[PDB]
Amino acid sequence: HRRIHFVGIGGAGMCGIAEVLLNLGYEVSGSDLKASAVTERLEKFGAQIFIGHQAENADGADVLVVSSAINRANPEVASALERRIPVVPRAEMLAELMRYRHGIAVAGTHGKTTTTSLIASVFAAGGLDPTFVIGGRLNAAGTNAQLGASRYLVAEADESDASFLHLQPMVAVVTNIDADHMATYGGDFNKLKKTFVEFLHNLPFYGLAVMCVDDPVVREILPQIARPTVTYGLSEDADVRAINIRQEGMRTWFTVLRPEREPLDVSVNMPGLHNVLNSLATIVIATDEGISDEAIVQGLSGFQG
Amino acid sequence: HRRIHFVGIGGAGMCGIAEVLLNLGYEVSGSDLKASAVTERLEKFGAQIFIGHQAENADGADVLVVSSAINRANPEVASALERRIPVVPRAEMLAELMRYRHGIAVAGTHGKTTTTSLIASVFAAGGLDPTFVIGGRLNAAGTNAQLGASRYLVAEADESDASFLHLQPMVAVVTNIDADHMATYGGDFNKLKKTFVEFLHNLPFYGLAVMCVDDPVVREILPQIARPTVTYGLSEDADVRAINIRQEGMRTWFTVLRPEREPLDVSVNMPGLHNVLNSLATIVIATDEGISDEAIVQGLSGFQG
Ligand SMILES: Cc1sc2nc(CSc3ncccc3C(=O)O)nc(N)c2c1C
Ligand SMILES: Cc1sc2nc(CSc3ncccc3C(=O)O)nc(N)c2c1C
Ligand SMILES: Cc1sc2nc(CSc3ncccc3C(=O)O)nc(N)c2c1C
Ligand SMILES: Cc1sc2nc(CSc3ncccc3C(=O)O)nc(N)c2c1C
Ligand SMILES: [Cl-]
Ligand SMILES: [Cl-]
Numbered sequence: 001h002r003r004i005h006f007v008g009i010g011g012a013g014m015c016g017i018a019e020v021l022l023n024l025g026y027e028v029s030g031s032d033l034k035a036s037a038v039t040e041r042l043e044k045f046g047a048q049i050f051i052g053h054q055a056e057n058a059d060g061a062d063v064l065v066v067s068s069a070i071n072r073a074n075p076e077v078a079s080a081l082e083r084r085i086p087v088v089p090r091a092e093m094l095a096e097l098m099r100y101r102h103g104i105a106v107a108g109t110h111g112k113t114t115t116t117s118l119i120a121s122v123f124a125a126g127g128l129d130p131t132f133v134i135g136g137r138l139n140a141a142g143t144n145a146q147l148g149a150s151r152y153l154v155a156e157a158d159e160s161d162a163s164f165l166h167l168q169p170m171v172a173v174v175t176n177i178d179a180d181h182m183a184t185y186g187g188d189f190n191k192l193k194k195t196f197v198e199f200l201h202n203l204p205f206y207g208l209a210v211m212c213v214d215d216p217v218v219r220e221i222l223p224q225i226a227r228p229t230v231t232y233g234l235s236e237d238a239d240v241r242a243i244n245i246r247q248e249g250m251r252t253w254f255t256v257l258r259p260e261r262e263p264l265d266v267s268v269n270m271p272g273l274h275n276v277l278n279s280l281a282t283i284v285i286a287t288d289e290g291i292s293d294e295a296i297v298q299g300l301s302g303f304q305g
Numbered sequence: 306h307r308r309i310h311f312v313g314i315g316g317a318g319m320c321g322i323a324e325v326l327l328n329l330g331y332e333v334s335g336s337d338l339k340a341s342a343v344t345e346r347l348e349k350f351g352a353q354i355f356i357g358h359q360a361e362n363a364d365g366a367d368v369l370v371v372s373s374a375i376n377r378a379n380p381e382v383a384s385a386l387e388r389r390i391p392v393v394p395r396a397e398m399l400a401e402l403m404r405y406r407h408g409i410a411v412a413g414t415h416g417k418t419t420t421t422s423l424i425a426s427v428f429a430a431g432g433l434d435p436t437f438v439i440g441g442r443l444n445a446a447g448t449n450a451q452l453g454a455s456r457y458l459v460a461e462a463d464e465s466d467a468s469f470l471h472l473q474p475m476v477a478v479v480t481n482i483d484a485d486h487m488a489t490y491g492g493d494f495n496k497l498k499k500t501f502v503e504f505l506h507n508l509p510f511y512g513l514a515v516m517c518v519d520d521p522v523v524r525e526i527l528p529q530i531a532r533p534t535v536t537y538g539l540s541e542d543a544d545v546r547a548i549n550i551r552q553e554g555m556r557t558w559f560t561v562l563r564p565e566r567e568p569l570d571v572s573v574n575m576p577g578l579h580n581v582l583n584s585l586a587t588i589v590i591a592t593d594e595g596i597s598d599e600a601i602v603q604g605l606s607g608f609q610g
Contacts, residue, residue, distance in 0.1 A: 002511055062533070063510050086531045088510060096510055166506065168473070201471065205368050205393060205401055206307055226391045228367070 004093075005061035006030035007070050007077060009049065010039050014067055016138030017093050020131070020148035022046050024100055031057045031076060045146060055079035065093045094136065095163035098153055101131075104285060105167050107157035107199060108175025108212070111278050114270070114305075115175060118282040119154050122299030126291040130154050157199070159192065160184045165199055171288065172203055173210045173281050177217040193221055203227045210284045212277055213238050230288070232280040234273065240284050242276050251301075252276060256283050264293055268300050309398075310366035311335035312375050312382060314354065315344050319372055321443030322398050325436070325453035327351050329405055336362045336381060350451060360384035370398045399441065400468035403458055406436075409590060410472050412462035412504060413480025413517070416583050419575070419610075420480060423587040424459050427604030431596040435459050462504070464497065465489045470504055476593065477508055478515045478586050482522040498526055508532045515589045517582055518543050535593070537585040539578065545589050547581050556606075557581060561588050569598055573605050 004021055006014050009030025015038045018028050022045050029048040032039055039049045050057040058064060058076040064087045066077055080087050098105070106116045113134050120132040124141055130152035131140045138147045157167055160181040177196055185191040200209050207227055213219045214233030222229065232240040242254045253267045254276055268279050279300055286296050309326055311319050314335025320343045323333050327350050334353040337344055344354045355362040363369060363381040369392045371382055385392050403410070411421045418439050425437040429446055435457035436445045443452045462472055465486040482501055490496040505514050512532055518524045519538030527534065537545040547559045558572045559581055573584050584605055591601050 004510075084534070086510065086533055088531050092531070093510065099509060165503075198470075204404060205309075205391065205398065226393050226397070228391055229389070 001027070002062040003027040003029060003060055004063050004065060005058050005076070005080075007053065007058075007064060007066040007074060008032055009042065009047070010034065010036050011067050011069060011090075012038075013090055013094075013136045014065065015039075015042060016147050017065065017090065017097070018042055018047055019045060019146055020097050020138060021093075023146040023148040029057065029061060058083075058085065061085055063088055065090055089162075091136070091161055092163050092166065094133065094138075095155075095161075095167050097148070098155065099168050101148070101153035102151050103167065103169040104152065104154045104171045104173075105157040105169035106155065106173045106175070106281075107159065107164075107196070108173065109159065109178035109180050111175040111274060112156040112158070114275060115173060115278040115281050116154050116156055118268075118278055118300065118303055119285055121303045122282055122286045122291060122296050123152060123154070123289075125299035125302070126286070126295035128152055128291075159195060159199075165195070165202065167199070168202060169207065170204070171208045171210065171285060172200055173285070174200070174218055175212050175277065175281060176215040177221075193217060197221050197224050200225050200227060208285075208288055210281055210288075212281065214277060230284050232284050233277060240280055240287075242280055245273070245276060254279075256280065258283070258287060261287075264296070266297055266300050269303060270305050306332070307367040308332040308334060308365055309368050309370060310363050310381070310385075312358065312363075312369060312371040312379060313337055314347065314352070315339065315341050316372050316374060316395075317343075318395055318399075318441045319370065320344075320347060321452050322370065322395065322402070323347055323352055324350060324451055325402050325443060326398075328451040328453040334362065334366060363388075363390065366390055368393055370395055394467075396441070396466055397468050397471065399438065399443075400460075400466075400472050402453070403460065404473050406453070406458035407456050408472065408474040409457065409459045409476045409478075410462040410474035411460065411478045411480070411586075412464065412469075412501070413478065414464065414483035414485050416480040416579060417461040417463070419580060420478060420583040420586050421459050421461055423573075423583055423605065423608055424590055426608045427587055427591045427596060427601050428457060428459070428594075430604035430607070431591070431600035433457055433596075464500060464504075470500070470507065472504070473507060474512065475509070476513045476515065476590060477505055478590070479505070479523055480517050480582065480586060481520040482526075498522060502526050502529050505530050505532060513590075513593055515586055515593075517586065519582060535589050537589050538582060545585055545592075547585055550578070550581060559584075561585065563588070563592060566592075569601070571602055571605050574608060575610050 010032035021028050031050040031053050043049050055075040058079045064080045067090045106112050120130050123130040130150045133155035179189050209227050209229040211231050213231040213235050231238045241257045245254045251269050256264045315337035326333050336355040336358050348354050360380040363384045369385045372395045411417050428435040435455045438460035484494050514532050514534040516536050518536040518540050536543045546562045550559045556574050561569045
């Protein structure tokens with residue numbers, strides 16, 4: 001049994017992580033400069049809150065989590081370093097949460113956010129109230145529970161993030177592989193691709209890689225993935241395809257083909273083939289997890305944007 | 306629920322992996338060219354054994370495991386590739402086993418084997434009958450159970466192995482970091498060191514890094530490990546130290562100092578300060594796991610070599 005201490009626990013990227021760790025049964029302390037509604041919610045849920053930073057606050061902690069809005073001069077951080085308490089950046093603790101849950105990592109250079117929201121919206125329609133991560137922030141749409149209560153944790157996987165390769169998902173999506181973040185990889189696009197292969201191999205052999213074969217780069221690395229995979233796209237050779245794409249208003253309709261299933265007519269309130277692809281990835285994941293066709297349709301058509 | 310198929314299941318590096326997966330509840334099939342006692346033991350334990358390689362054997366498998374003693378021309382492998390069944394090398398399935406167990410990964414360029422044996426010998430003295438991996442082979446000293454029955458899985462972590470960075474231990478040792486395998490890292494010793502840092506960061510924040518600070522390279526990367534660590538060595542600043550090293554026969558005696566513990570007198574039937582260091586790493590791990598001083602002494606003094 002361990003105690004995590006958050007430096008700046010009221011920060012908006014930190015509060016959610018604290019509430020999940022409370023939900024997992026850890027002792028959670030935290031320091032902030034201003035008491036707020038957030039720090040009182042955390043206290044109502046079991047967290048020990050301190051106001052103002054002073055080295056005593058870090059006493060007893062087995063780990064420190066520090067935002068990027070903290071200085072090494074901060075007394076608690078300095079005390080932790082002197083006592084050899086490990087100090088972990090906000091983003092790494094966030095990625096670790098996936099080890100305690102059925103993690104669905106949504107990777108890809110673009111469309112991570114929309115695909116994560118669509119997944120959460122479908123799972124919610126199937127009664128699963130999943131916790132999901134968008135832009136470093138934990139949410140659970142209309143949850144009446146603590147963050148993390150669901151079995152399911154759906155998260156953006158950013159290839160530019162230091163923790164990209166420390167995610168431990170059960171399921172991983174790759175929407176596409178662009179060159180926006182070659183900088184993170186010494187400016188070499190081929191090293192960027194090798195990183196997506198390494199990421200998909202953090203999947204266990206019972207896991208699932210959901211791959212957009214409409215991206216030539218994804219199709220290129222596909223033979224390297226020694227994990228169960230399901231492909232999607234408009235490509236006639238994808239496992240899960242969209243056909244008869246049509247419009248009635250700002251609502252896109254299409255028909256999804258799935259192996260050993262009857263064609264399903266869906267609609268999403270979003271334009272452009274890239275959001276059809278984001279729907280297809282969601283349909284692939286929701287179908288693997290066993291969610292009904294009715295919840296898939298309701299989840300997709302309800303999402304606003 | 307999944308079925309794993311082993312190509313060459315009688316192979317000595319493969320049989321142990323098959324028996325662990327049986328113990329974890331998976332369906333396990335396997336093909337070999339000769340029936341042997343090994344293949345009958347696997348069948349007694351639940352495995353479907355086929356003799357001679359033919360594509361039908363791979364039917365129904367959700368994954369294939371293939372040794373290095375197989376050809377891509379092998380019909381089962383070829384059938385799996387055509388049907389898109391993932392094909393996994395023996396060494397990767399072996400590293401995955403650690404995800405199902407309380408994994409203790411023994412890394413370091415030298416002394417992995419002796420330290421793994423010492424750990425297993427101490428845990429056995431404490432009644433834990435651990436499964437352990439030496440040279441790619443699963444053992445459980447005098448077990449009366451299937452491989453994998455123990456909660457504990459103790460394994461060598463070879464920095465030259467492709468799966469080094471896909472181990473998911475609860476505890477990791479690093480005995481030392483030499484330059485024997487720079488070849489694996491493009492011949493750059495500094496890239497070799499960065500790999501040990503990345504490896505230790507596959508530890509969860511509740512895990513433990515057991516680090517030999519008598520190696521200057523280990524001491525160099527220590528400030529980079531944002532995980533709980535315990536250090537060992539003769540260095541006067543190590544957490545767990547050996548002192549009053551003495552001899553009576555081919556048996557080395559010494560006294561172990563531990564934080565907030567009384568000094569413990571141990572002995573090991575092995576010469577040289579490097580096997581004192583291997584004992585210290587074992588004592589660190591056995592002390593973390595809560596094993597009694599009596600089992601530690603009995604485990605260490607009983608080990609032969
Ligand atoms: C700002 C935006 S929106 C957007 N949407 C797409 C969609 S690509 C695509 N769509 C559908 C089917 C196949 C493919 C493919 O060729 O793989 N691509 C982009 N590059 C962008 C950018 C730069
Ligand atoms: C197969 C597919 S789908 C797809 N969708 C996008 C979307 S890009 C984008 N979207 C939304 C907002 C901004 C941007 C941007 O570019 O700033 N990009 C791609 N490269 C692909 C590929 C290869
Ligand atoms: C064939 C062998 S046996 C052996 N044993 C040691 C031991 S090193 C050592 N021992 C004790 C305390 C500190 C240290 C240290 O200086 O970290 N080092 C080696 N290089 C070898 C080789 C090449
Ligand atoms: C702190 C320590 S302990 C230690 N122990 C060894 C052992 S090397 C070795 N052992 C056994 C058999 C062969 C060999 C070999 O070298 O072939 N090497 C080291 N570099 C260290 C360090 C830096
Ligand atoms: Cl640190
Ligand atoms: Cl493969």
